[PDB]
Amino acid sequence: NIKHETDYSHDWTVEPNGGVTEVDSKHTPIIPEVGRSVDIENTGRGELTIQYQWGAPFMAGGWKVAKSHVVQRDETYHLQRPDNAFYHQRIVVINNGASRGFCTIYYHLEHH
């Protein structure tokens, strides 16, 4: 009795020499919420960093890093969301290298 479920994906570019691309975001300023996990497939020639970031109410003190991981070319990596709830959160992909960055993000949706 296998069932098909639908998730989302999206392709992204990340500029070289410090580009940052936002690939997910959530703002829940009244009641905080747990976020969403993703997988990243690096489809470019150089490495990328993926980070899970959070912010306090009013973004006081700017974004903070909860998780970070480096993904090499052709690899796919699962970024599990933190177990705690946030007022602001996002996932970014950062390209600190000289090669243009490319990736596909697979978003793990909520299923019941």
Side-chain angles (χ1 to χ4, degrees):
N1 347 30
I2 298 178
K3 184 178 156 156
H4 298 276
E5 299 290 353
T6 62
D7 296 293
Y8 307 149
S9 73
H10 196 300
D11 294 348
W12 301 101
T13 62
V14 196
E15 301 308 316
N17 309 119
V20 178
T21 298
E22 293 185 313
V23 302
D24 203 357
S25 75
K26 179 152 75 183
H27 304 284
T28 48
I30 303 174
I31 309 295
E33 296 188 9
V34 177
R36 172 156 58 193
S37 297
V38 303
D39 312 309
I40 175 171
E41 177 189 12
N42 182 346
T43 66
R45 302 193 78 253
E47 68 191 4
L48 297 169
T49 294
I50 191 169
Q51 301 193 324
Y52 206 106
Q53 297 186 354
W54 71 276
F58 310 110
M59 293 298 304
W63 288 109
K64 297 99 171 64
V65 180
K67 296 193 172 189
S68 188
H69 187 85
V70 176
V71 186
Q72 305 294 319
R73 71 167 290 167
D74 318 318
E75 292 183 340
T76 301
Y77 174 74
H78 177 74
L79 177 58
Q80 179 68 20
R81 67 183 179 200
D83 290 336
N84 53 302
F86 303 112
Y87 291 96
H88 302 281
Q89 62 199 295
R90 67 173 181 168
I91 300 173
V92 293
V93 183
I94 304 172
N95 182 4
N96 297 121
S99 296
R100 300 184 187 303
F102 297 89
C103 64
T104 298
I105 299 291
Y106 300 94
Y107 296 87
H108 288 287
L109 304 179
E110 180 185 2
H111 292 125
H112 295 294

